[PDB]
Amino acid sequence: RECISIHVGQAGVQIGNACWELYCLEHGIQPDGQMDDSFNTFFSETGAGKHVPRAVFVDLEPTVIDEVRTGTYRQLFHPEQLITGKEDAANNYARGHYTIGKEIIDLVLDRIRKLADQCTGLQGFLVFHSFGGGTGSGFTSLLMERLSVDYGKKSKLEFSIYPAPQVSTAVVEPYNSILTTHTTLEHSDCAFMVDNEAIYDICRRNLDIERPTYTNLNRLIGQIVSSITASLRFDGALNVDLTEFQTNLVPYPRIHFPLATYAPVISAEKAYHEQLSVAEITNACFEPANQMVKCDPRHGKYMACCLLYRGDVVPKDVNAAIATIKTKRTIQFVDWCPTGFKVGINYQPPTVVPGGDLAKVQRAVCMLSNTTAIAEAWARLDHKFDLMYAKRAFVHWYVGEGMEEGEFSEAREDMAALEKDYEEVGV
Amino acid sequence: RECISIHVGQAGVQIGNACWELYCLEHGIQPDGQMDDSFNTFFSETGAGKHVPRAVFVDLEPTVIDEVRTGTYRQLFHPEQLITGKEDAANNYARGHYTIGKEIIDLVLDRIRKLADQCTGLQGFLVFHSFGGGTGSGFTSLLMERLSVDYGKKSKLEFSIYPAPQVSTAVVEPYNSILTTHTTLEHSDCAFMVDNEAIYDICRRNLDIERPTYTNLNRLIGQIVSSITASLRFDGALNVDLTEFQTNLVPYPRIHFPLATYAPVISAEKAYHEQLSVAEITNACFEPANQMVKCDPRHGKYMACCLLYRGDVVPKDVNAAIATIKTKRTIQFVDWCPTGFKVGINYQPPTVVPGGDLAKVQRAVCMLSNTTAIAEAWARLDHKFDLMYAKRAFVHWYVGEGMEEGEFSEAREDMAALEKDYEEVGV
Amino acid sequence: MREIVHIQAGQCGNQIGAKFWEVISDEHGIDPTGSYHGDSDLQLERINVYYNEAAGNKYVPRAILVDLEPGTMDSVRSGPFGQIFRPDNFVFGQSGAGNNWAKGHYTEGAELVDSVLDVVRKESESCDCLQGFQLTHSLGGGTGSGMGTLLISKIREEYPDRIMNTFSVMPSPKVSDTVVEPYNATLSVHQLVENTDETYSIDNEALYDICFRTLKLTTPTYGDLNHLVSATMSGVTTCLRFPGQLNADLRKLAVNMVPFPRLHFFMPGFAPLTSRGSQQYRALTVPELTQQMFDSKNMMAACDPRHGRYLTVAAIFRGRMSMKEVDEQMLNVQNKNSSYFVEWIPNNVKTAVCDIPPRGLKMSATFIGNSTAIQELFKRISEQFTAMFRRKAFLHWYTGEGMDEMEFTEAESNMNDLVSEYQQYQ
Amino acid sequence: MREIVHIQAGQCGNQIGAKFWEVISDEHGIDPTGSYHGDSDLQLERINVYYNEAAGNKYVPRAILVDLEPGTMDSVRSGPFGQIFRPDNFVFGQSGAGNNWAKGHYTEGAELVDSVLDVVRKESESCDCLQGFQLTHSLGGGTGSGMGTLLISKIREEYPDRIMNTFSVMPSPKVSDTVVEPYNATLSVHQLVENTDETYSIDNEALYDICFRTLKLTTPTYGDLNHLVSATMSGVTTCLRFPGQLNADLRKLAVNMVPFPRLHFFMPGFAPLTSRGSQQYRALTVPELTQQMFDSKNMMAACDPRHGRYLTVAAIFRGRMSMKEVDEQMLNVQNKNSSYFVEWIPNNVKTAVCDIPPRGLKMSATFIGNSTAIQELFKRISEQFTAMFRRKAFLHWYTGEGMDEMEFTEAESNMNDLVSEYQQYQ
Numbered sequence A, B: 001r002e003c004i005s006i007h008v009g010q011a012g013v014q015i016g017n018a019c020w021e022l023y024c025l026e027h028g029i030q031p032d033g034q035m036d037d038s039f040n041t042f043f044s045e046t047g048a049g050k051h052v053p054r055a056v057f058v059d060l061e062p063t064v065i066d067e068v069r070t071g072t073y074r075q076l077f078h079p080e081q082l083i084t085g086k087e088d089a090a091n092n093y094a095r096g097h098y099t100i101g102k103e104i105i106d107l108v109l110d111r112i113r114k115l116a117d118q119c120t121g122l123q124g125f126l127v128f129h130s131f132g133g134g135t136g137s138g139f140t141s142l143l144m145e146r147l148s149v150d151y152g153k154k155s156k157l158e159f160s161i162y163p164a165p166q167v168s169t170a171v172v173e174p175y176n177s178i179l180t181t182h183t184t185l186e187h188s189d190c191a192f193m194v195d196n197e198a199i200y201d202i203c204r205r206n207l208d209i210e211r212p213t214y215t216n217l218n219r220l221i222g223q224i225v226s227s228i229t230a231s232l233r234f235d236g237a238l239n240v241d242l243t244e245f246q247t248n249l250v251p252y253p254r255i256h257f258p259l260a261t262y263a264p265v266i267s268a269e270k271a272y273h274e275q276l277s278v279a280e281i282t283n284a285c286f287e288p289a290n291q292m293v294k295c296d297p298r299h300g301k302y303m304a305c306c307l308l309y310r311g312d313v314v315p316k317d318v319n320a321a322i323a324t325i326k327t328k329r330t331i332q333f334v335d336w337c338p339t340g341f342k343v344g345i346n347y348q349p350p351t352v353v354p355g356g357d358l359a360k361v362q363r364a365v366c367m368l369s370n371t372t373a374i375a376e377a378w379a380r381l382d383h384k385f386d387l388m389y390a391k392r393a394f395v396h397w398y399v400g401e402g403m404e405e406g407e408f409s410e411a412r413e414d415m416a417a418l419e420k421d422y423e424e425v426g427v
Numbered sequence C, D: 001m002r003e004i005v006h007i008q009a010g011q012c013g014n015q016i017g018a019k020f021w022e023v024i025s026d027e028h029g030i031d032p033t034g035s036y037h038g039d040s041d042l043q044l045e046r047i048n049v050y051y052n053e054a055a056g057n058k059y060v061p062r063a064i065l066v067d068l069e070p071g072t073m074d075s076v077r078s079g080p081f082g083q084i085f086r087p088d089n090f091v092f093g094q095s096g097a098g099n100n101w102a103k104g105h106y107t108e109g110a111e112l113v114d115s116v117l118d119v120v121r122k123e124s125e126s127c128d129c130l131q132g133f134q135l136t137h138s139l140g141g142g143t144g145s146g147m148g149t150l151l152i153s154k155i156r157e158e159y160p161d162r163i164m165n166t167f168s169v170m171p172s173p174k175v176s177d178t179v180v181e182p183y184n185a186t187l188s189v190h191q192l193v194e195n196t197d198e199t200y201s202i203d204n205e206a207l208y209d210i211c212f213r214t215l216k217l218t219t220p221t222y223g224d225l226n227h228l229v230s231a232t233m234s235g236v237t238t239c240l241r242f243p244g245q246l247n248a249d250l251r252k253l254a255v256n257m258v259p260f261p262r263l264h265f266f267m268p269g270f271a272p273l274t275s276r277g278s279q280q281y282r283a284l285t286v287p288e289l290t291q292q293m294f295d296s297k298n299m300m301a302a303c304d305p306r307h308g309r310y311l312t313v314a315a316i317f318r319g320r321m322s323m324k325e326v327d328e329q330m331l332n333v334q335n336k337n338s339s340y341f342v343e344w345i346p347n348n349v350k351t352a353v354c355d356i357p358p359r360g361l362k363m364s365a366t367f368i369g370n371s372t373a374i375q376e377l378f379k380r381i382s383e384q385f386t387a388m389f390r391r392k393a394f395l396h397w398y399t400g401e402g403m404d405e406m407e408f409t410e411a412e413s414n415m416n417d418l419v420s421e422y423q424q425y426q
Ligand SMILES: Nc1nc2c(ncn2[C@@H]2O[C@H](COP(=O)(O)CP(=O)(O)OP(=O)(O)O)[C@@H](O)[C@H]2O)c(=O)[nH]1
Pocket: C009, C010, C011, C012, C013, C015, C016, C068, C069, C096, C097, C098, C099, C100, C138, C139, C140, C141, C142, C143, C144, C145, C169, C171, C177, C178, C204, C207, C222, C223, C225, C226, C229
């Protein structure tokens, strides 16, 4: 019951800085790399009293891969896993895919094969990237093509980071987001999305962090990925493996875009002045104020909702909680999936990061939802791309890499064909 | 169970500097030459509390034979064994074979007879040389002719060092390599090859030695020769003597050119962050990135593969490892030898050199492979010779020694006749 | 001597099966180590019907514990009674079913069921004369639903005469713990009605309802539900495990509870089910047990019996009791409540009484009932099936394992035919 | 009194032979020093059949340990039981065979076999009446395959009436430890079928399979495999070593297991083979041993018996047991499984039972079987032979020792004829 991870781009490796911080903390694994069957999913034993992740960090720019090599997590990570490039993709989908992409995939794809044969219970994959720069967009679509044709049958958990609706770190990333989604549609088995201003807004309102940096964001993002894989790492009343997400949330093979959320997002001082049970955290995860993307669920419908709980949670009260969700009319499921609910329970609760921002709670929920609410984000992301594409803005960089007018049109009609499915299933 | 060694040329004696460094280290023999039945294969007892190798160092130039006489290994080596010449062969196959060769073979060949009668269990021979200079090429072909006619029935392990494909220390050595192979084909029973840029590339990638000198190279080369003879020096689950290599790897009496490789090539800091078992080191030895010659095995086929292991290795897991090699389709055996596998196990693990570069490991593999991949090295080595031979470049030195147009043509057609066999068995 | 080979499949089937061995081992006075320490010699009389004699006065159950997730066996092995089972019976794969009926029936369990069938042959040939196969599985998920019906097909093929006993835990929409419930349920019952002869339709919604109303538990875990389902399994086999004034074999229950071969879907019950507070305020007399048995709310299925009629019911009693008061209560529950009993059958009741009550309790009873009201469980599952099948949601994950759309059509027709026939005799 | 001279050849034959003396010496209660300290006097009754009496109440086995590598004798001499052997029996050359059949048969062993034959004459003439020669060798390599068949030819020449017993350890392609396996195997069996009367075809692939499935060992060394092969050797000779209700000599096994003179290639088995965990969860009764004996997976050869049919099988039992339950199990295993037994033989089973079980175990059994399915071991070796022989790879190393290509042709014809005759009676 293993699952190997890869981390592409600045956003991916920055997630790995905090995501593996809480994985090794949950299993008592110090940064030195030592202190039974729980840690085998993400940590392999090396001889006697030592552990190594099944992790790969790739970034064509050498800026932050070496930062881990000189940071505090030097002994934990095997130094050959920390793969680095020579020059930067520089916010170009084509540069990370054809020029600089094609010089290092021969190293990392065959290295990912090495971890496969080292493992036996490889369930699937979980990649970490963003649609902002060329690394997270170009190199992943290149690698996903060669990883899909290599294995195919195995699953892939895509934890992408959108560009926000109005907030944004760059100008050219609509070209990156529309081009990487043209290839990611037919390859990724599950596409989990994250937004920038939403997670800024969540910790400001609920957690009361008025001035967060990116390291504060990646703590709870790793908690979200840690929650879905906690059922594999620990025992519970009703465990769910990675294969449940493909069978429960993907009604059609093209609409495979869930939405992640987490609760209770509560600070240290508010935990004492607020009681936590399954009912209020369940209703808290469905409201738009706590969704990880800037899309309101009332505009659309929930096709499916996988509720993954942690900590001491009995199995009879969850049935009462989901009953209140079904009768509440502000959120409504589709008639084609009336029993749109899956429950998962784990006895081991979440762990608090030392020096972090989140507070320790006896129970927590990590709810995944496949819905039509993401079609609004696709439309406004596709709409803003049309103004730059109409004037041929920033096209001379991509076609200078080797592309042409053609694949931009294929990326446009593919997005319309994707939205053609969302308006179809929204009936 | 003895085997006497000779060392010709600068490359041969430089191998003996490090190769005997690890032989005497493995048996607890200090450089003084003293501290039961394990060391008798390569060390004879001298009276009481003293040992002497069954070694002979010959080099027509006196440059480095005296360096051992004034180095640290003065007491270990009997000073009459350290034979030296008076003037240098000077990168001429003819000069080391006819003019300066014929003045000292009368000393060393009759001296090699002295070690034969001193011994009783002489299994065969193992010579050390290179095809670069006239010493390693000319004198060996002269001595091999007189040693073959003297004994004949005994075996000879030829550990040659090729000139690299594009890297090279000289210009005339294609004449040396093609002429010495014309005589070495009918005399040598086993012809093990080594390349210069390959061993530079192996320690750079795997061992992380960015600036190696020749003494770093000869440490692992002696480890390769020490691995094949460890079965004679120690006991194991399935021992293999020198006679197994002739019967297992030589399907036809002309194709007797194996390829050597070694694994795990791992540094000191990477040993803690990487687990070593028989599976990954087995797959590591077949890939082109760890082969000792610049030839890719996927272009050709493996005719045979002798897997010699060391250290604590059980006999049931090796059968699982070779099964994965047989089903992996990136490397494929010939249909005429479906069971192309031989296993050898030794309980005594490899020993680390003090102050060296390699790290101590509980298990190691020294895999020998007879294949058609070496035919590419013969062709490019024969191809580059044709440009110099067509313009009669550097011919006036060899024919000034006494040769003529004839034997160059015999050396050319002999190489084509050798390659005629490789394309034949490649079907 | 009428031996019984036990099968456990799926996480729920292993959980109710694990607690099931906990209860009856205490009835026979069997240590967790397997050594016999019972007081009465009658416990060791028919101990062979679920155990095998071993050296050192040790015993081992004939429990074939099947799954596709190895974590379920570790919980059973580490449990209070994991050490009594044979280590060879634990046949289990590596990857879970993922809540897919077609995986366990065609790809995942199809390779594993061949290994399990050899163990069924091992325990059967060691028997003197086996009576039936007591299987425990849930229709939710892929393991119990898909691989379980495949295993039932092979055993029914090789043993076309033995009693194929199954305990199908089937949930309702009130507790929808999995989105793929109707496909797992509709496809599983397509095989059960053609092969099996007993189908104890137990629902989680009814099981939680027992804990609040009559048991009055604040935090009913699954283990509390497993204790109730184990009580029904020990009740039906109590006749053929101990001496009794009327010993009804499972075949002698199947002959009375199955007026037509397809009408073999039952609805179990158990009594006395008293809370901790209501222990002293309740009489142990026989009429008090009977009113709790035929109580409409004390059924272990979501379907209320008042919405239909009983074709035939059975009441397996335990402990010392007069037969006359039992006959009057079996008589009275059909006179005044004749609307809830079909009158084209003259006597719809089966009686049985053992001379050994449960451990700790003075008297007890166990109810079986084949009601026409049970069809609404199949009706609502068909509504959920047709709701998702009308647009073919989540069917493509079944096509990967070679399953075709016509097999869903054939299951739905056989499902809907089962609803019509209970409506006939209502 | 039916004495047995023991031969050991090759590294594998010396290893299984070395562990073989370890087991039976503990059955007779013999110290490593050779002094007798057994509890029961029956152990000292037929001690002469494998040992010779010496001064000081010391004993020495009649073990002629042959090899061409001196390192094998040093391991046996330094072992836990090296001190019991006579130092004179260690006849060994200086240079190993190098995995060449022609070396041990013509050049290396041909000079050494003349010295070994004098020791065979020494141990034979000291006997009262020898029954047969118990030889142990592997068909892999040159020593056991080449020199062993040469030694068998001379002993068969001088003793054309005694029982030539051999234990030919022959590997499969699943475990190909040597590239020269088919030439060593195909040439060795060319001499065995013409001379010998018993050939126990043991495979390393099957031997590893026992350790994982039924023995459940994590790290099966060769010594663990030697313990299993030694159990079969002690089982077949248990009749003529201790009193028993039915004492079957090796000639009395050869008369029943050899319906035609060439059909003398067997497939051994042993039971109970239980893991450390499954010790207490298993009954020592006779039907439990019989189902493990005839288990298709518990054979020590790569060929499954279900692919063919048994011409004739034998079951040498050990320990106190009723004959009636043995006869029923020998009866039942041919009634229901009649497809796996040829019916032109009416009774394909041989029975035997000793009154002394193995040391530490209460009961035991040992299986012999001449199956038509065994031909696939010869078929696959012929496929490997013809694969390498079609282009004549590695044949020139056999021409140096005077061996001609026609001898490979004559071996292949006799090999292929052996495959056809088992296909006849299938
Ligand atoms: N009365 C009880 N019901 C249970 C228990 N465990 C699960 N269940 C119920 O049965 C439903 C499905 O049964 P299972 O848990 O066995 C799912 P299964 O193991 O067969 O498939 P996979 O786990 O996907 O391999 C499940 O949704 C619960 O409603 C239990 O311990 N007791």
